[PDB]
Nucleic acid binder design. Structure first.
Ligand SMILES: [Zn+2]
Ligand SMILES: [Zn+2]
Ligand SMILES: [Zn+2]
Ligand SMILES: [Zn+2]
Length: 114
DNA sequence: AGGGTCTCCATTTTGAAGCG
DNA sequence: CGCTTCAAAATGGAGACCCT
């Protein structure tokens, strides 16, 4: 197993090919948004970051009455679930039955338990 | 192959309602 | 005004996907 070179990086890899790709993430952040300065290692991310600027919401809710738009594919899926009702984050407390559909929504709930 | 891309997830970060 | 709540915006890493 190849351990990631990168000074403080704890990570380990099967093939040094996976290690090298990975290593890429600590690299110089060459891709700098001309609008505000944020920089990204890849260009894909800088492109995507642009949606912070335009406001473009490409993905839309084909639910009757909804039609809400989101800028990101994944973010849309996470909301349509408020239609499906899929609350996939079941609380852990023995005998507390609250479910959630966001691991932020659920774990801070846990905080309440304490 | 193997390098840029992109799809996709998990996560983090931000905001708006509810409500006490 | 305090939260907890629920909902959205955004980021970062893995690794699949697509070349030539
Ligand atoms: Zn590393
Ligand atoms: Zn920017
Ligand atoms: Zn919807
Ligand atoms: Zn609980």
């Amino acid at each position: 197993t190849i351990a990631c070179p990168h000074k403080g990086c704890t990570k380990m890899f099967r093939d040094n090919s996976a290690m090298r790709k990975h290593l890429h993430t600590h690299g110089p952040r060459v891709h700098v948004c001309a609008e505000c300065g944020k920089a990204f290692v890849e260009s894909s991310k800088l492109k995507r970051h642009q949606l912070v600027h335009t406001g473009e919401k490409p993905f839309q809710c084909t639910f009757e009455g909804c039609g809400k738009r989101f800028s990101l594919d994944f973010n849309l899926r996470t909301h349509v679930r408020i239609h499906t009702g899929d609350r996939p984050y079941v609380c852990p407390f023995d005998g507390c039955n609250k479910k959630f559909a966001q691991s932020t929504n659920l774990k801070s709930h846990i905080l309440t338990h304490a």
